[PDB]
């Protein structure tokens, strides 16, 4: 799935008040219970990456936010063989979760889709 | 998405200092007896009910339906099993 | 299936080669040998098995060497091409009651004796199963229970009518070691005769697997110093951040 | 004589004396029924065989190790 | 400890011999070893505990 | 440069053992791989060596088998060597695809890898399908009738093909010659095919437990996976030790040392335990053809996981739902393992059914839906 | 936190007699082991396996 | 009397029926049988009973 499937249908979601009511605490607590700000790490370090419009993406960040990430895999990285768990200011805290990545791979879609329609219109 | 030794295909890494000791000069089994307690015990406590639950479901599931099928092909279970058939 | 159509299941024996270091005891397989020869063999092949094969196992080379000598095996034609008879060698197999299936089935009212060289392992429940076949004919079979005719109860054969009749009482063999031969010490023997039969490796192979379980647990535990030595550099690495 | 007669006896008699007396009233009811007439033109005729299991296999749970002590 | 790691441990030709002499070793000395205990255990069963019937 | 550079033939041996980069987190359950390399080479040595001593022809192939056993020097060990390898193999196979499909291995851009794995399970199945009839026991001869008969149900051509490969009528001399050279030839086909899947994954690498790409962070494969794999080799070794010396014939069917007998049939003819799942699957569908395709299907079917996995993240280890998800997806493969051997009889006919709706609706429907609820629980969550 | 030249905490781990020959004769006794057991594992194995390939008892009767 | 004859593996058993054997079997109801069919179906020839001797 496309990040701009998620965000669309999330932003439906949060549209609706009886939806949200209901689907927002679900989210949290699956966040909660997911354990990656466990591991140091923040969402967006979780998105697969190994594509032609993620490459992009990532090559789009601003240089310190990609230092950043680099750090936060390698530390991550280096938890997950040690078998030993985030401590202290290591741990993600819900106001670090910034979705850094996000915005750029929006863009990215957004003219991949619009090649693609455009490729495949009719003059009419 | 692969390079190799000095090409990996790393995004630029800056700012990192990483330290380590030789393995003749560290103790290999430092720590050994609080990780095989107290770390094991953390990773399975978090990790138990996603094996206890679809294991103790199933096992259940298995262990009604051959204690059926026992009973159906005993004496006293002759005519439900004709029923069954 | 009903239970009966299964079998009763036999009991679990304590035979003395139950045991991660227990060999059979060869006292007892000589005298299994001795109730296969005097009661099975009338029925009952054991053509897997060579003269050579009981040597050093239940009997020493010039009792092997005196059964092989006392039968009569074809040889090769003579120089007229006509047949001729040998005495047996320790080479030769021991040779079966009957010459084809048609002649067992004739003389068993239809039913086969299988030949017992891999009985034991060629039925669930191995030694104990052969045990409690032979032990257990009830004099009377359970009320209800229809017999076809040439069959016997025994509820731990499938279906419950078997074609062999109970053959084991008490003294029908008598042992040349002394040891009373009542129906249950003959079941034993011949269980553990047989067993030995089907798996004459059993001793040297649960003994070399004694030693390989020594080497390979101590290669696991080296194993797991020479790991933990190797990867301490990678594990105790530590990181300092200064971001740019 | 043969350890097991004996062995097989007390157990019938001590441990496993429910199950002796299953069988028991088992064969009794068969029995009387084969007795009746019109059982050969029955539907369902009865055997013992599941009672005999079950004694059977508690006389082989409480003797078996018995029985090879004394082997 | 200098002199042991000087003479059988520094040059790999001489780790290497020692390994394969005390390999040597061992698997003639294990080999007696499980021979006798495996005799012990299993006493009286054997065929080597009743040949002299015989 | 360094002579295991420089020269072609060394390089490539180095690509793949010794510089090989490799993510630093790999946990235990990535050395399946190995002791699978491990299990095909045991396989190899022994099955060659069984190949020097063994009679293909059906009047010897049984007692082929017993000579081996009782004559050649080391034979039981061989013999047994070889047969509980054979489970072993499949214990490892299934390990290394329940990893491959909880750390999202399948996924791009490890598609090509993954494909050409489920050739090589294929390919497996069927190497041990023939060797298990060489033997020439009661349930090589059955399990070859019963197994091969599925062919009848090709439409048109069906039964033509099944005396097309048996070599006549029934299963019998002909079908035994044929499954010994073929048995011999399939290991060395599914050693290609194995090699092929790793050249493929070269070009990404290794997947990690995190699911990130380990870009950042590499070690060598030698020494630290070497020696990491040392570790499970012997673990290994040890549960072989206890089956071939001190249990050989646990894994085993008694019927098997009863020689084939076109007469009598075997109470229960049920195919070796690491088939039975797909035995199940095939049950559950009334129709002869039907339960062939459902069969297929339930190999072919991982052929898709790349496509109804919608996750935007690789693996589960951190999606709680997908990890309920996958425990039952697992527990129900083993049930249907276990209804493959049950007496077709109630109630274990329904159930057998329900499990294989399960086995399906995994992918089809569970694994889609809960992956695009995923998606937007970690998106909104992290808000 | 901020100086590299601070060497982060290795006290847990770093042995005090880490430059003695003493302490480096330990790992090679384990590691000399390993190699002893793995070498007559090895010979044992080889000699077992191959000997299937001596003439075997119906052949030597 | 019934033969037992081997053809491809599977047992055939040769029956030669008497005349009251062959009007036994005409007599049923082909109606009140899991498999209906009446002999003629099944034989070629009154007296030659042959089938493939395994229980369905
Ligand atoms: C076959 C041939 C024999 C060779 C043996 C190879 C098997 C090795 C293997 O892959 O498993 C070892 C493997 C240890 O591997 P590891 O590299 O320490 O951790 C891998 C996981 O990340 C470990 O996950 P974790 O860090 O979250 O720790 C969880 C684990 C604790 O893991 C251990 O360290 C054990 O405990 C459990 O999950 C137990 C389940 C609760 C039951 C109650 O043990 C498990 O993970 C068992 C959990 C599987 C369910
Ligand atoms: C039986 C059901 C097993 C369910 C497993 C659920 C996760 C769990 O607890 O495992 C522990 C671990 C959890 O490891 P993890 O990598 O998710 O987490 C490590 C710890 N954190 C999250 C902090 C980084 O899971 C594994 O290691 C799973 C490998 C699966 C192999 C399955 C083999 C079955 C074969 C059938 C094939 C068809
Ligand atoms: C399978 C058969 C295994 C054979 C190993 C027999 C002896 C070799 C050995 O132990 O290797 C130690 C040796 C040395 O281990 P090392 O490489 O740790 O030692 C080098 C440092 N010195 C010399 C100072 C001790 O390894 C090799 O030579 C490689 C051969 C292993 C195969
Ligand atoms: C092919 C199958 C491979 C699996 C091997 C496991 C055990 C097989 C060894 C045979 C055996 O019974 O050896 C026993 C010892 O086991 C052991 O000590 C062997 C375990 C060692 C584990 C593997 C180490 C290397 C083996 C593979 C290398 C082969 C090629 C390399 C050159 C005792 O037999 P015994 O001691 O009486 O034997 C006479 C020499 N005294
Ligand atoms: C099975 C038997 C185990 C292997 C026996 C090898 C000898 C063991 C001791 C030798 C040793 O430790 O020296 C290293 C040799 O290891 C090596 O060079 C090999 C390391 C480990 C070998 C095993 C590799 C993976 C095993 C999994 C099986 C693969 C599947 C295929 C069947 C040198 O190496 P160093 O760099 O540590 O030297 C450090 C400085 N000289
Ligand atoms: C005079 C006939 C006869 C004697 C004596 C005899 N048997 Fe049998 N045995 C048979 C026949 C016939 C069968 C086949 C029974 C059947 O399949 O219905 C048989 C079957 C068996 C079976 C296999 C039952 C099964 O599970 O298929 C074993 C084991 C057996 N015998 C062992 C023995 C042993 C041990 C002895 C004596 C120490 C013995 N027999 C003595 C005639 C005999
Ligand atoms: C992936 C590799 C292999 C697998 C999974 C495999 C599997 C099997 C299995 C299940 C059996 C039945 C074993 C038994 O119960 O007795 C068997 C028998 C046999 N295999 Fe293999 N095998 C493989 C490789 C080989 C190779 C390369 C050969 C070379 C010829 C071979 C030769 C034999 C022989 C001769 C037998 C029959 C004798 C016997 O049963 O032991 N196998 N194989
Ligand atoms: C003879 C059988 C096989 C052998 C020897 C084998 C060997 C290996 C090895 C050595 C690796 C790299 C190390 C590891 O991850 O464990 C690997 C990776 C892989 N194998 Fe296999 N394999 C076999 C069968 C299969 C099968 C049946 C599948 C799939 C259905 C499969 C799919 C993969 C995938 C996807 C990877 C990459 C996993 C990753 O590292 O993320 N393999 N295999
Ligand atoms: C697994 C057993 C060991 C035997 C090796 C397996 C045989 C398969 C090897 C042939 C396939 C060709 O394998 C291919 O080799 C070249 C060099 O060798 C590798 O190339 C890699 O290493 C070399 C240097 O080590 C670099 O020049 C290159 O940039 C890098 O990608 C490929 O990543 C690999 O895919
Ligand atoms: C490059 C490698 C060099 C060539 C390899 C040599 C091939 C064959 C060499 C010897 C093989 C037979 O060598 C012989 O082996 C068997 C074990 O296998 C030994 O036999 C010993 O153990 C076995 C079981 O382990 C017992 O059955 C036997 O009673 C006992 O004497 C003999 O004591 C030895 O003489």
């Given at each position: 799935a496309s990040i701009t499937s998620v965000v669309k249908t999330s932003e439906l979601i949060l549209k609706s008040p009886l939806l949200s009511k209901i689907v927002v605490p679900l989210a949290k607590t699956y966040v909660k219970f997911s354990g990656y700000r466990q591991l140091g790490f923040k969402m967006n370090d979780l998105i697969i990456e190994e594509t032609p419009n993620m490459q992009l993406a990532l090559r789009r960040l601003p240089p310190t936010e990609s230092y950043d990430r680099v750090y936060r895999l390698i530390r991550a990285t280096q938890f997950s063989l040690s078998h030993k768990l985030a401590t202290g200011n290591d741990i993600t805290k819900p106001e670090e979760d910034d979705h850094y990545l996000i915005p750029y791979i929006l863009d990215v879609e957004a003219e991949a889709f619009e090649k693609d329609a455009l490729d495949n219109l009719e003059v009419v | 998405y692969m390079g190799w030794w000095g090409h990996m295909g790393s995004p630029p890494q800056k700012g990192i200092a990483g330290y380590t000791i030789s393995p003749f000069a560290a103790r290999p089994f430092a720590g050994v007896v609080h990780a095989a307690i107290f770390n094991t015990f953390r990773r399975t406590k978090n990790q138990a009910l996603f094996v206890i639950l679809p294991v103790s479901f199933f096992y259940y599931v298995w262990t009604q339906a051959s204690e059926k099928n026992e009973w159906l092909y005993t004496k006293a279970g002759r005519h439900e099993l004709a029923k069954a058939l | 299936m009903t239970a009966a159509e299964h079998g009763l299941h036999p009991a679990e024996y304590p035979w003395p080669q139950n045991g991660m270091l227990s060999t059979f005891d060869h006292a007892s397989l000589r005298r299994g040998y001795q109730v296969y020869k005097e009661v099975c063999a009338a029925c009952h092949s054991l053509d897997r098995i060579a003269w050579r094969n009981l040597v050093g196992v239940t009997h020493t080379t010039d009792e092997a060497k005196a059964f092989a000598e006392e039968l009569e095996y074809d040889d090769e034609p003579d120089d007229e091409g006509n047949p001729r008879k040998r005495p047996g060698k320790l080479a030769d197999y021991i040779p079966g009651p009957y010459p084809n299936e048609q002649a067992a089935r004739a003389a068993n009212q239809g039913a086969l004796p299988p030949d017992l060289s891999l009985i034991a392992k060629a039925r669930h429940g191995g030694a104990d199963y052969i045990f409690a076949l032979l032990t257990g004919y009830p004099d009377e079979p359970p009320a209800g229970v229809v017999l076809a005719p040439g069959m016997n109860y025994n509820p731990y054969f499938p279906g419950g009518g078997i074609g062999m009749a109970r053959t084991l009482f008490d003294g029908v063999v008598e042992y040349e070691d002394g040891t009373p031969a009542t129906t249950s010490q003959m079941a034993k023997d011949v269980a553990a005769f047989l067993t030995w039969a089907a798996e004459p490796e059993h001793d040297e192979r649960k003994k070399l697997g004694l030693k390989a379980i020594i080497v390979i647990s101590a290669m696991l535990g080296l194993s797991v110093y020479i790991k933990k030595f190797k990867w301490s550099p990678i594990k105790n690495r530590k990181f300092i951040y200064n971001p740019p | 004589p043969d350890p097991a007669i004996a062995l097989h006896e007390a157990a019938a008699e001590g441990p496993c004396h429910d199950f002796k007396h299953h069988f028991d009233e088992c064969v009794e009811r068969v029995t009387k029924a084969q007795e009746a007439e019109d059982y050969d033109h029955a539907e369902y005729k009865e055997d013992c065989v599941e009672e005999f299991f079950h004694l059977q296999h508690c006389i082989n749970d409480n003797t078996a190790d018995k029985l090879f002590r004394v082997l | 400890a200098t002199t042991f790691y000087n003479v059988f441990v520094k040059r790999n030709s001489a780790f290497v011999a020692t390994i394969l002499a005390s390999a040597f070793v061992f698997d003639m000395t294990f080999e007696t070893a499980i021979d006798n205990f495996w005799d012990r255990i299993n006493a009286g069963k054997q065929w080597k505990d009743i040949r002299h019937k015989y | 440069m360094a002579l295991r550079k420089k020269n072609s033939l060394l390089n490539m041996a180095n690509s793949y053992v010794l510089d090989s980069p490799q993510p630093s987190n790999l946990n235990y359950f990535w050395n399946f791989g190995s002791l699978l390399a491990l299990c095909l080479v045991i396989q190899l040595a022994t099955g060659i060596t069984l190949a020097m001593h063994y009679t293909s022809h059906a009047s010897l192939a049984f007692d082929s088998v017993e000579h081996i056993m009782?004559?050649?020097?080391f034979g039981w060990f061989i013999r047994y060597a070889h047969a509980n390898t054979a489970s072993f193999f499949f214990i490892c196979i299934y390990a290394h695809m329940g990893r491959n499909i909880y750390y999202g291995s399948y996924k791009t851009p490890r598609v090509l890898p993954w494909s050409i794995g489920v050739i090589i399970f294929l390919l497996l199945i069927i190497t041990a399908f023939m060797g298990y009839v060489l033997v020439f026991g009661q349930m090589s001869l059955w399990g070859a009738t019963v197994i091969c008969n599925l062919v009848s149900a090709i439409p048109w051509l069906g039964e033509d093909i099944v005396h097309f490969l048996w070599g006549g009528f029934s299963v019998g001399n002909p079908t035994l010659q044929r499954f010994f050279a073929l048995h011999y030839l399939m290991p060395f086909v599914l050693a290609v095919f194995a090699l092929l899947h790793l050249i493929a994954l070269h070009t990404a690498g290794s997947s990690n437990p995190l699911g990130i790409t380990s870009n950042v962070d590499k070690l060598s494969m030698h020494p630290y996976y070497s020696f990491k794999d040392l570790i499970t080799v012997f673990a290994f070794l040890l549960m072989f030790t206890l089956f071939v010396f001190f249990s050989p014939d646990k894994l085993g069917h008694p019927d098997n040392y009863i020689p084939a007998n076109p007469m009598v049939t075997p109470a229960s003819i049920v195919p070796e335990w690491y088939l039975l799942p797909f035995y199940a699957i095939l049950r559950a569908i009334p129709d002869k053809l039907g339960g062939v395709i459902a069969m297929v299907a339930a190999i072919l079917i991982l052929l898709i996981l790349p496509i109804v996995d919608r996750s935007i993240i690789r693996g589960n280890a951190f999606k709680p739902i997908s990890k309920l998800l996958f425990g039952f997806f697992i527990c129900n493969f083993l049930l249907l393992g276990v209804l493959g051997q049950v007496h077709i009889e109630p109630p274990f006919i329904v159930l057998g059914q329900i499990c294989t709706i399960f086995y399906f609706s995994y992918f089809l429907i569970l694994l889609p839906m809960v992956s695009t609820i995923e998606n937007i629980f970690f998106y909104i969550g992290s808000l | 936190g901020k100086s590299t030249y601070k060497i982060p905490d290795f006290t847990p781990y770093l042995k005090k007699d880490r430059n003695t020959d003493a302490n480096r004769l330990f790992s090679y006794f384990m590691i000399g082991s390993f190699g002893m057991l793995s070498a007559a594992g090895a010979k044992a194995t080889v000699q077992d396996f191959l000997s299937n390939m001596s003439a075997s008892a119906d052949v030597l009767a | 009397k019934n033969v037992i004859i081997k053809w491809r593996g599977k047992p055939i058993f040769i029956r030669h029926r008497t005349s009251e054997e062959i009007e036994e079997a005409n007599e049923v109801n082909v109606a009140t049988l899991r498999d209906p069919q009446t002999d003629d179906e099944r034989v070629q020839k009154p007296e030659w009973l042959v089938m493939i001797g395994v229980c369905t």
């Open positions: - | - | - | - | - | 009782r004559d050649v020097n | - | -």
